[model samples]
Target: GSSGSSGEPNHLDVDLETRIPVINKVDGTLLVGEDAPRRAELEMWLQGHPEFAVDPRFLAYMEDRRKQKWQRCKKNNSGPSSG
Candidate 1:
């Protein structure tokens, strides 16, 4: 379905052609690409590794990501406001 009446592309439909390498700072493990299998594997690994859960820096990064997502959702829902 189309994203909204604003005519902007859906966030989920954004192309992930840019390959950003996500690395685990603790063990130098690299996560590549934006595929479901890779994401599931990373989630499972994080579940087993509790150290990241307690790391302040990691938590902050996750929080920022969540904030960005929320902001995007809000923008899409509200559309452009008239001054």
Candidate 2:
């Protein structure tokens, strides 16, 4: 067994272990929470209400979340002195 050159480009490192949503998130219409692929009624409901298509806040939330997908959680914190 001859071990020589390192794994070129290391294709496996590109894998993201997190379970991100596999669909498009920029869709400003007919997107319901939890899941979206299994229902026609929700889409129909969203379709029925023209006023609900795009909101100033939620679209911003989705867009923000989309951009923040590179990282995860945080919380308020206090640190003790390490004396």
Candidate 3:
């Protein structure tokens, strides 16, 4: 029998306590934003990270988050100061 949950859990084996190693910022500035540099940087980072590359499920999860991030980026300013 199927439960009432909408779908499978997003993070199956992700380390909740561990922080993502890649930083899209530099010198207190965001390297990736509503510009081409952000997408290019992200793609290059994903390509270089083989551990994530081997996991199809993880990649799918990341793609979902990537879209969400872009949405958020477009709606907000460059940094916290804007608020």
Candidate 4:
């Protein structure tokens, strides 16, 4: 089996230690984690309905998260934040 340079397991070979549940907004189904059996089907549905891609509230939430991350990085003197 292949291994990562840092000795971590290959990203694709990593198994979830905890399952996170995600709600499917398109169909109101609850999907739990990356190993969920229907993940591919849900992805196909989302791709087919591109209209669900844009939401002002979601964008604002992401912007707020990005700002918080940038602030944390700047405080730690890691590097310059990107746009």
Candidate 3, residues 1-83, lDDT tens digits: the string is 32333344454334433233322332333222232123334456567542332324435665564344222234545655744
Model 2, 1-83: lDDT tens digits are 21333323322121232111223335545444443332334345455543443334544543443343243489867887769
Regions more than 4 Å wrong, model 2: 1-40, 69-83
Candidate 2 deviates by what RMSD? 16.2
Global lDDT of model 1: 0.41
TM-score of each model, in listed order: 0.25, 0.25, 0.19, 0.26
Report every candidate's CA lDDT. Answer: 0.41, 0.38, 0.38, 0.41
Tens-place lDDT per residue, model 1, 14-39, is 23343323545678565445522233
- What are the RMSD figures for all models against the true structure? 11.5, 16.2, 19.8, 13.6
Sequence-dependent TM-score of model 4? 0.26
Q: After superposition, which runs of candidate 4 have C-alpha atoms over 4 Å from their true positions?
A: 1-42, 69-83
Alpha carbon RMSD to native, model 3: 19.8
